[PDB]
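Risk mitigation, structural track. In case the binding assays with chloride ion fail to produce interpretable data, a predicted complex structure has been prepared as a fallback.
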Amino acid sequence: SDHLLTEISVNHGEHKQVTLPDGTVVHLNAGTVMRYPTEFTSDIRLVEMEGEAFFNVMRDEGKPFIVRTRQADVKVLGGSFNVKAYQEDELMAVSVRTGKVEVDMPESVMRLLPNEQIIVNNTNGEILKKNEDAQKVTAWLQGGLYFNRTPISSVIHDLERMYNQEIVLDPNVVFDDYIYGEHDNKSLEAVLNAIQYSTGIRYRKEESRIVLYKTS
Ligand SMILES: [Cl-]
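Fallback model:
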């Protein structure tokens, strides 16, 4: 007896770590699913994932490592990078710590170097390649938060997943804020207070939910 294929799922509020058969180390963020084989095929090292993970890929220049998501294939020979691709999110991002990374989509193929990032907007189809501190992007590894012109909906999803908390918007209020912020491991209430400071977004408890709102 022996398993050939495994699926690891991460709940909201938690983290998981996996060493793959090739020696690649994966850090899986809250709400992530990853399918991987107990032995890789001879031609590539393929994994399937939905959510967010940080990969530390074992260099093998004759056997590419592929992170397959619904929207893209992230291919390396070696390196370390973050893939953020939650099904519920409007954005997708691939950020490189070390190594060279190819992000392959039907409409674009881009090769990224350390501290380069690709942001794909699943709504309007806009793609952006820019420079970004990969250490800040991977702040979730140490339970931190990093927002750089991040839409409020992505901020809410990040908070819901990190703290395993339902966060709901007040239907009377308009929310189209872009958040800027950097938080060390803090409580949800400390982060919501920091967001209140820079946006005026207030929060209230309604049973098991947190309701966000604004007022004049
Ligand atoms: Cl490397």
